[PDB]
Amino acid sequence: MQDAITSVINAADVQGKYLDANSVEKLRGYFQTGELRVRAAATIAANAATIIKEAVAKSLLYSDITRPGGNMYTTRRYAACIRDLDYYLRYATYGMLAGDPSILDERVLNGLKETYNSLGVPIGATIQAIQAMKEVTGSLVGSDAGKEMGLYFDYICSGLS
């Protein structure tokens, strides 16, 4: 994993240079918005249970998926349903804090499209469930805090399709 601070240290170190003016400007961009992410990161951790409960019921609850013969039918399949959505919500909160989506490519999108295709999980429905989870999570942290939040929800859906 590399955050916004480490990503600028990387760009400088590959040239052997100290931190110049263009580098110190990117560092102030992170520090100035830093205590806003720490406030949004605690607000989502407190509403994690309801962000998923309202996203599921609104998106895929009375759908054919929960009826006999579909995916998420058995209780284990339902429990693996809502266990996956909390994985995305918990990792998108790690990315908004670090300001760099590098943690999502190593520990979330690490070949997740092949796993969902083999098992038979509907990729079209999981992308719309994450999207439904973006409209309820955005009404909590506001627009300015939701900008960096929704930036990573679309990263998971784009890296999943």
């Binding site: 609104k58 054919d64 509907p122 719309q128």
Partner: protein, 380 residues
């Protein structure tokens, strides 16, 4: 009863636009009705004159050296005794029109251009084409322009003050004739000098043949291929810019196809549309788990009513019953929102969407396989 009158009839006295134009592709693009008002400023006599030279010449480009023959009939319009239907009669009878679209054109191509320019209507059936040939051979070019305009069709559609436009009529009298219109107005960036080969057949752009393709579709009643309606078309100039889940756009014909990947695609559409026939039948009765208990759960909940909202004490504590129409049924906001997510959640709609993504890919992979002997191949 959806529509009440077609566009081939005159407008009724209680409407601004016609009814069939209100939900057509007329509202979505540039093919609309430009009307000249009662008293015209000289700046907004250009807005009517640029629209005439768009339509009646079919996106041909009149240079100013050759717009000089039109200043006599331009000024007769700018004065105001030539209406728009009389300006286009003299413009069709001009010399710059007969050089472009008559003096090198086969007689099929000249009639289908006059159907595109004077009317907003590709030629409908064959005996209509035949009777319009059978005036020019007997009466010459002069009276034949009075065939298109001095009938009931021009007065009912354009009147005398609207510039002609490509009509998106709604109701098409053959349904093939919608395809002819899309094959004739084929592109915003196109023009009949290109589509008729009238620049490449001649010398330095002059002396061109205005030869027609799709002649045999007039005589033998045969449909237009779907590529000529979806890739270079008025439907791309009037594109609704929707989200469409079967996206109608024609993908580019790929280089490097192989007969292996066509056979897997051809097989999997037979797996999908056989599954669709056995899933559509399965649905409409036993699809719903909570449906057989609905009459038993509807007879259990029909007592304990609180008219002045705020009853159901359940002890001495208070409960806040609301008497809305939705919440009386026990429903939430997610009860009406589930109808929006039935595209990646329904099993009958997932099959049909996945079927027509595949016949989209199959219609362009098969047609690229119509190429031959010196073809270099690949390893996927």
């Amino acid at each position: 009863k959806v529509v009440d009158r077609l566009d081939s009839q005159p407008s009724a006295a209680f409407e601004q636009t016609k009814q069939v134009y209100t939900f057509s592709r007329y509202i979505l693009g540039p093919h609309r009705a430009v009307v000249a008002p009662v008293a015209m400023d000289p700046s907004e006599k250009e807005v009517v004159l640029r629209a005439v030279y768009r339509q009646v010449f079919g996106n041909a480009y009149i240079m100013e050296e050759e717009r000089a023959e039109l200043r006599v009939m331009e000024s007769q319009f700018l004065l105001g005794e030539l209406s728009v239907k009389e300006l286009v009669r003299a413009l069709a009878k001009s010399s710059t029109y007969k050089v472009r679209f008559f003096e090198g054109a086969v007689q099929y191509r000249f009639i289908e251009l006059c159907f595109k320019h004077l009317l907003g209507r590709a030629p409908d059936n064959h005996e209509e084409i035949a009777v319009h040939m059978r005036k020019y051979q007997q009466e010459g070019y002069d009276a034949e322009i009075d065939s298109y305009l001095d009938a009931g069709e021009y007065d009912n559609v354009f009147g005398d003050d609207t510039v002609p436009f490509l009509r998106f009529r709604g109701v098409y009298t053959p349904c093939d004739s919608f395809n002819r219109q899309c094959a004739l107005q084929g592109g915003w960036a196109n023009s009949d000098k290109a589509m008729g080969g009238a620049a490449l057949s001649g010398y330095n752009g002059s002396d061109g043949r205005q030869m027609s393709t799709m002649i045999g579709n007039y005589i033998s009643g045969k449909p237009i291929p779907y590529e000529k309606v979806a890739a270079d078309t008025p439907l791309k100039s009037t594109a609704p810019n929707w989200y469409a889940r079967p996206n109608p756009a024609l993908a580019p014909q790929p280089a490097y196809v192989s007969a292996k990947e066509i056979a897997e695609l051809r097989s999997r559409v037979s797996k999908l549309e056989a599954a669709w026939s056995v899933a559509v039948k399965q649905s409409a009765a036993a699809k719903d788990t909570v449906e057989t208990w609905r009459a038993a759960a509807k007879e259990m909940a029909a007592m304990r009513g609180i008219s002045p909202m705020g009853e159901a004490y359940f002890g001495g504590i208070a409960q806040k019953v609301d008497n809305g129409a939705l919440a009386q049924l026990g429903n939430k906001a997610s009860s009406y929102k589930k109808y929006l997510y039935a595209i990646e959640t329904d099993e009958v709609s997932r099959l049909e969407v996945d079927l027509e993504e595949a016949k989209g890919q199959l219609r362009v992979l098969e047609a690229a396989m119509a190429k031959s002997t010196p073809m270099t191949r690949t390893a996927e």
